[PDB]
Amino acid sequence: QWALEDFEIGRPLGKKFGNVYLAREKQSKFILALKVLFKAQLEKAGVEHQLRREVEIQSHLRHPNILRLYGYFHDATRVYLILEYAPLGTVYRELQKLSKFDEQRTATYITELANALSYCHSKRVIHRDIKPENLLLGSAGELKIADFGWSVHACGTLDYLPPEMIEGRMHDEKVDLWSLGVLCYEFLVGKPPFEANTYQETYKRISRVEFTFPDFVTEGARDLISRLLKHNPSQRPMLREVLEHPWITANSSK
Ligand SMILES: O=[S+](=O)Oc1cccc(-c2c[nH]c3ncnc(N4CCOCC4)c23)c1
């Protein structure tokens, strides 16, 4: 039902796995994002099925703060994904430019994130790879979760991975609550709470939950973060109370 013939390619949006390009559905004049994946990478990495997994998960997943996947197709040498175009780019790019985020922006992003995750959890879908470069911004500054590569229904940088996952133990939906704490930290500080020059160092800093707060962090923020960043998953608060946390309720937008 789809072919490269149907699309006019444009500006390179970014990104190994394969590049992402701005494109236009010729008949519809609809502008979207097109990621080209070379099956060569699919072979050597054995991600031939992982794609077939996520492409089913995301394709029938509809939420304002989740980047939509409209469809997919393949030729001889490449695989193409037709994704929603996020005009305001990534949050990672935003964070680079502004170094740090204010509490309104942070609580707003965290709010939009939680809402999208609850929905995912409703369909019993866990994301795990919630990272600034996987968070896009829509036309209205809308936060939009992207990339469901490791999304399932129950190795690079370890910064956003929870203790139970890096130790090999069993991981539930509380994984995303860990990441949510990591982001709120990085959104406020500009750096992840467990950063290191070493995979091995970050491993220990994560596993022992060793994070320190700079002075400009509000106690209202120090609370939520330290509540989301707990070694025992069962102690991580529910997504509902996150959205009901006073610091969130105060600084988040409407
Ligand atoms: O793993 S795949 O889903 O590929 C991805 C992973 C994350 C976002 C992504 C999307 C989706 N829509 C987009 N509009 C504008 N830039 C995008 N970017 C930022 C710059 O880098 C390349 C993607 C982008 C594609």
Give resolution in angstroms. Answer: 2.9
From 9, 11, 13, the mutation candidate for ligand 1 (largest count of ligand atoms within 8 A of CB) is 13
- Torsion sign across C-alpha atoms 147, 156, 199, 238: positive
Rounded distance between C-alpha atoms, residue 226 and residue 239, angstroms: 15
Q: Which tokens is 93 given?
A: 């790019």
Show the domains of the chain with their CATH numbers: 4-83 (3.30.200.20), 91-251 (1.10.510.10)
Is 6 catalytic? The answer is no
Q: Is 18 helix (H, G, I), strand (E, B) or coil?
A: coil
Rounded distance between C-alpha atoms, residue 212 and residue 190, angstroms: 13
**CA–centroid distance, residue 90 to ligand 1 (Å):** 8
Rounded distance between C-alpha atoms, residue 210 and residue 194, angstroms: 7
Rounded distance between C-alpha atoms, residue 9 and residue 120, angstroms: 31
244 is in an annotated binding site: no
Residue nearest to atom 2 of ligand 1 (CA): 147
The H or E element that residue 183 is part of is helix 174-189
